[PDB]
Design an enzyme around this catalytic site. Sequence first.
Site: not given
Ligand code: HY1
Ligand code: CA
Ligand code: CA
Ligand code: CU
Lengths: 720, 718
Positions: B518, B683, B363, B376-377, B529, B460, B520, B384, B661
């Site tokens: 903010h 955004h 943000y 960092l979702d 390969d 989100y 995204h 997952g 890296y």
């Molecule tokens: O999505 C990012 C951090 C977060 C986690 C749970 C509720 C609101 C915000």
């Molecule tokens: Ca490769």
């Molecule tokens: Ca490397």
């Molecule tokens: Cu947004």
Amino acid sequence: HMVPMDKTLKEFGADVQWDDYAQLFTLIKDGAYVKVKPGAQTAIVNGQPLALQVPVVMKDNKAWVSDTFINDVFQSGLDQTFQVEKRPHPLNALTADEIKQAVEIVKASADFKPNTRFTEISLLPPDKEAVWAFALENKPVDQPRKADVIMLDGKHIIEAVVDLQNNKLLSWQPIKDAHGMVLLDDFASVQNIINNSEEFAAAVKKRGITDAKKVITTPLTVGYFDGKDGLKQDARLLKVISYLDVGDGNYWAHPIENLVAVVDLEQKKIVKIEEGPVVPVPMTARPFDGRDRVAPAVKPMQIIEPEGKNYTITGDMIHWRNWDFHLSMNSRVGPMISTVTYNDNGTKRKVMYEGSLGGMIVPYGDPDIGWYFKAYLDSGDYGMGTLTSPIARGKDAPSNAVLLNETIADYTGVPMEIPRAIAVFERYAGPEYKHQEMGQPNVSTERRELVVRWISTVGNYDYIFDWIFHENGTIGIDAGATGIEAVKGVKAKTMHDETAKDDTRYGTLIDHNIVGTTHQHIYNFRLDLDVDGENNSLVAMDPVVKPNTAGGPRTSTMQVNQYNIGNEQDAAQKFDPGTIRLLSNPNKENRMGNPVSYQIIPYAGGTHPVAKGAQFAPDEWIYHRLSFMDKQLWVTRYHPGERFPEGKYPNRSTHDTGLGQYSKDNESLDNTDAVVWMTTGTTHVARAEEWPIMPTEWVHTLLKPWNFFDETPTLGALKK
Amino acid sequence: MVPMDKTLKEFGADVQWDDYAQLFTLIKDGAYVKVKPGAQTAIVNGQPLALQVPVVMKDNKAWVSDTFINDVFQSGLDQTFQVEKRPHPLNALTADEIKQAVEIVKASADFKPNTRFTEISLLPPDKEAVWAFALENKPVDQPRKADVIMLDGKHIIEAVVDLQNNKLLSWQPIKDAHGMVLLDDFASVQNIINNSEEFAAAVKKRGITDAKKVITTPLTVGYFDGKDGLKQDARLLKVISYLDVGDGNYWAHPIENLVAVVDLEQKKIVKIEEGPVVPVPMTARPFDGRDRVAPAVKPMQIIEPEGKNYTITGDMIHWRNWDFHLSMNSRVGPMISTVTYNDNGTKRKVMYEGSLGGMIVPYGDPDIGWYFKAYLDSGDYGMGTLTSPIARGKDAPSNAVLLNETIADYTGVPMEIPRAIAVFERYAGPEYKHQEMGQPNVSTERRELVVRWISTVGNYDYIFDWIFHENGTIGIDAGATGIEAVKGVKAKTMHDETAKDDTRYGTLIDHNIVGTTHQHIYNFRLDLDVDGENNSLVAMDPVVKPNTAGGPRTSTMQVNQYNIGNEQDAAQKFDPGTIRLLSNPNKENRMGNPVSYQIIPYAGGTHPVAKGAQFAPDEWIYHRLSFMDKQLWVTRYHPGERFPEGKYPNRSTHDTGLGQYSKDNESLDNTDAVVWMTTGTTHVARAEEWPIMPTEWVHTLLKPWNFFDETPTLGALK
Ligand SMILES: O=CCc1ccccc1
Ligand SMILES: [Ca+2]
Ligand SMILES: [Ca+2]
Ligand SMILES: [Cu+2]
Ligand SMILES: O=CCc1ccccc1
Ligand SMILES: [NH3+]CCc1ccccc1
Ligand SMILES: [Ca+2]
Ligand SMILES: [Ca+2]
Ligand SMILES: [Cu+2]
């Protein structure tokens, strides 16, 4: 008596499906989704029962129907997709009769000439204010139906205005120095002139061609080179590039390189033949129609709407959810979207008075004799509306599409109906919005877009245009490019051959002895947006990083530099996808006090590299004649006579009579009727994957409502 | 007998009745069934099936055998799913393996009483052996192993287990590494705030009469070299609060300028930061339609009555010329592996592994409750794990097949996510077309196979489509919708006194509500390969040069080609007007050109584009996350380098991801390369996105470049 069902229905253009298990026929044709069982007394049309006088008869495994089946069923009325227009919209295109009328009027004038052809016979636009009054207040347009008749007397352009209501000629004005666009008969003329040319037959023979009858010509515009091309500006000319017909249905794959004839149309003769190094003609058969291919088995996929469509077409007006617009056809630029409003909880708010393709250019970058002049203005010099390509049902458009026919005038002034000219179809486009709150019931709604597709083919290129109306207020406009590439014949078969390096300096070697000359595709759209009214202003919002001056650990913050663009000169600019540009209405605000606006996005992405502008040194004439090429965004004062980016008469034009001209007076754009022009293109560097036929490549543009509404547009009708 | 509608809907199948044809049409995933009452047979995907017991009508209610669903749906006539006799080496850990792995580490004496599991995933065999399995059916003669990352209180421990031999191979404590946020942390935070006398008082001060209506959110605190006054060794989370007013949307009721800092091991608030008091926006703003009525719409169906063109064997998917493996990971979600294109009989390598690398939503507001907000979702929350089940027919088209996937939860217990991934084919306009003047037209339709995954973290909702085109092109799109994080402000319209200050860092999208600006930023790890392991990075810049061939032209269009030999040079901004290829210098097409793939990090988007990070180079988030500022990265293949933001990004002090890296600046000449694409948006909000935001998309592309010798979709020669 009766007729065979399958044969008859196919002829009719309907899809026929037989289900042996259900002993049921499913017939689909545009808005009609029909079901009928052999022997049954009734059929189903869009979920509704229809009594049949003669049931479908099954004989020895063959179905037969009455000679009235098609009309009784498909024109029953149970398919409500199309409704009859009661009060004729003022923007309706000229009818066949009107076309013929306009032609009788000019042929009644004492000046008309026998060889006089028609480059364009179109409706003359009533005043904008009267048309909106009609669309919004339902006020009749008391101004007479008029038509512009642009004629070509030999090589001279003449502009005439006819009064259709009172059947009388209103004006006949000759336009000096103006050249007319290319017409259909010029194609036949060029091939004929070359076939009768003793010298050309000789030139062709020395280049390995035995039977000169197998030579296919192509009519190309020459442009303007201040005389460096050694061409008399005054004459009506065309350059000719040839190919050899090998019988593979794709002559484009057999170029006769370094041979160019210059033809003078009125003189019907070859006035010049430029010759270069002899290059062996690529002979290998390279058909693109599948004759030499195996047909892969694929499982069927149908998109169906068994109860009919959500849109209704009354005359030329389309209604779909909150949208309302008028769709017509022009022989030059093609489809025209007019009087576009969005119904905001009962109130029809103005969005766009008139939108359509503005013009386009496809300039090549090879200096050689058969390429240096090649810079096409397809709509302007050829008339893309006239060259519309009928939609291939189910392939060029999804199977749930409705195909419209459109009528225009051909070059001889005779009414011409283009079958399947425009496709209309609704489509699923993922979730409109979604939110899965943890541990709570999910919330999701599907997105629907209404697509209006039109395809035009000019020579080897096939162009596709989609006008996308999103249910949420957004309007998209994409351009697709496919067809066959204009290649250059070269000696190298692979990059390992001695001439490879030089043969591929201006393009990739996409096949043995074949190079795909680099070029660009630059499209321009004329969008007369009236954001909730005619008086608007152009506002810029540049996202920027500024130093933190409020305390705390952060050194910077994300803010926006907002400022108005008060004049046309400053509105003509490059587009930075990282910034925001709005056509606001300073007279109307939303619930939060913000000016209702629309975000203009000339560049929303594409599948080919993006054209940052015209790939020309600032000292090339093409770059000079046409300035709309180097800027992605233009905004001018509304004027009914300014509609083309390249100018009204771009054929061999000496100076910019388009956007360069429309803005040269740098007029004020503060709170007045504005017109947006979006330019977007691609830079095409070929590859083998695009030969012998090119997979469709797309570019996207977007128009999003910005504080035009007070909340999520698709939330739904308020319950309390 | 048993009721049909009742039974079939519990099964998840769609039931349609056509009274005119007296026919039932049953649909569920790849099964398209037609059965008439009283009929002795039925139709499954175009094929006849004999029934033991015909469907019977009882009082206008259809009834079926208690074995109907099995006899019809598990009949075999639906060929969508096929049995996997030889398990692919990249198959994700099964529920049995997840339980075995947890037993192995629990049998160790070092395992502590309340240890949680941040991640339990497959430790993949070597790349070479995997490729040999997919291309030669050669068995992977290596035991199935699993990485088990544990969180003992706040301490991270990495362990490796041997599933085939049931033995612990290694146990390594990780110094200074903070663990990601786990689900139970969400509850601790809410509970800790609830039992806080201080907080309740702090809240009372701001106008909240009932503290029990205060909804909290667990937010990572980032790193600021101490300027935020937080201990580096303490596992912390900041807490932003909202007021629940009963509209099912607490996000619309921010309690601005109130931030609590919670220590998870001490289980208590260790710091409360109070700022100017702003009345909480109260107006009900539900987003679930409780206060709305949808307009009636004519039905639309997308059907494949003869079944799908794709086959799913275990996790291997076959469709046309494509073959790939689809697996699930608790952190980054779906992984596309061993991707080959069957070129006229020969399977050619395209991508060994591809998946979301990582993402961040930073943000731009400096104020007390926003300056540290940099999510960092995937890395800090596990996308997952937070997969959102697909709403059939809505989140995905009606002709889709919905797959279930299994991962381990934070306590080490198998967790099956229903409808975790959608697979569907779709019409995508004409593949190609040419209408030669006065000749029969030539058109063929385009088909794409989309693999869609949706993950939701807090407010989100993120959508990811992996798009396979018949012609060899691969697309990757990211969509964003959900609820915007808003700021409470005093201004109700832009005509109020504080309006200008209130909207300095965001748009006023509603009364007393500002959608803070903010970005995204998505990053994709693509171990391409190109027709083989050894590749090189080639740049092709279209340029305007002076004409030297003579004639009227003063300039020409040429290409500037050159190789990019090392990692540092590979890390660059992407000019959508240039061309970047990953070529195979050892293989060429029929014309002598190196078989290649065109890399396009930016192919479009519906929101303004993020040309880089909207942060000054001296901001800490900027230092920690270098991947935000470059759209293209290429590094040497390494099994342990999989995240752009680093393996342990929670409160990280320096860049352990792409910055690390590439730090070494190794050679990228004719060797195994890995491409990373960074694509983002900036955004700036608007009213049209409130109370819920319409899905916004970004597009990326990977196109074959002289990989083939001609139009890939023309077909095989007769
Ligand atoms: O999505 C990012 C951090 C977060 C986690 C749970 C509720 C609101 C915000
Ligand atoms: Ca490769
Ligand atoms: Ca490397
Ligand atoms: Cu947004
Ligand atoms: O489309 C551009 C000019 C043209 C016209 C007809 C054949 C080939 C090329
Ligand atoms: N050793 C493989 C994991 C496993 C454990 C128990 C039953 C089946 C499979
Ligand atoms: Ca002007
Ligand atoms: Ca206007
Ligand atoms: Cu092109």
